[PDB]
Design a binder for these strands. Structure first.
Lengths: 91, 93, 93, 92
DNA sequence: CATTAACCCTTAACGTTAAGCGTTAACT
DNA sequence: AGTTAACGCTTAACGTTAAGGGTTAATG
């Protein structure tokens, strides 16, 4: 239930089109470990990257961004979620 | 029109709508006063641990705050390198 | 004999023992802030240069550190595809 | 102190002793011919992997290899940086 | 008070640099 | 054949700019 925006790039744009991380940052005109570290589930999706990524693969920008925010949000919960209702229950 | 910072929302639809204050709103979420204000001043963004805190406290889907941030972020990466990117990258089309 | 990042050693025997931070130690070694913070979070490794600054400051042999990094990489490699490597290579006997 | 590439070792006291040639070794180890040879020539080091394969093949500890490389790495950092690091740092 | 400009720690994303790979195609 | 360019991919380590966050203080 936390899916990295990475896994999605790899498991379906890279692999589908048989593009390498090295070749992708070459198209995106960003450096090599930029695209590689997002692929490895070690970096996230900046908004500069979701603009590049969406431009290339013909998708909306938010699509990457919302792939991110579900990853970031899943990860704040299950780290501190219940330790927050026991903190703020108000309205 | 496009860039609108999630703070602008917290004032105008939640604080301004409930006669609530920042120092007041820090206390509820159980975080520091300078973090609620700096969002409200529009000099800081929504983190996920934040959006969970505002989500729970205003009976809001946490995905709504992060989306307010989601867009405001893209808005300003366009218009800062928007024309740059569109020139550097040709699609897979 | 099992996989322990050297970073684990750094906080559990040194930082916590002498009440120092990542940020404070990095200033004392003359490296930038995440060069020490990343080792502590078990996300970067002890390079020779890092292993020599660590030696000096904490009056230890640099070998000490480079062997905590030796063990960590070995154990990482093995099982990642040890046995498998044992299952590809006859020795000379 | 003095630096000694782990190649020197695998060559002098391993590959000369047992009449194995680099491109032979590469095979038994199931690794490409330029890794073993680039290690012999002293232009590449022993990765954590290589250690394990060389150690397996030669009935030694993968440690043994990494320690050779720990020490070639150290002696090379020192000297190239040794002094100014001791000078810009003060212990406790 | 409630709000701020002070710092300080930690930490994400970026471009550089450079090291280990295998693949290929030379040479020796 | 063995030895080795010379490609290209991956991936580690670094300084750096800059973000969120809680101290504290100054302010209003």
């Amino acid at each position: 239930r936390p899916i990295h925006p990475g896994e999605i790039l790899r498991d379906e744009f890279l692999m589908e089109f048989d593009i390498s991380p090295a070749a992708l940052a070459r198209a995106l005109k960003v450096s090599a470990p930029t695209v590689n570290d997002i692929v490895r589930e070690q970096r996230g999706i900046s908004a500069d990257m979701a603009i590049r990524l969406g431009r290339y693969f013909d998708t909306s920008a938010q699509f990457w961004m919302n792939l991110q925010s579900e990853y970031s949000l899943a990860t704040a919960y299950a780290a501190n979620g219940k330790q927050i209702e026991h903190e703020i229950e108000p309205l």
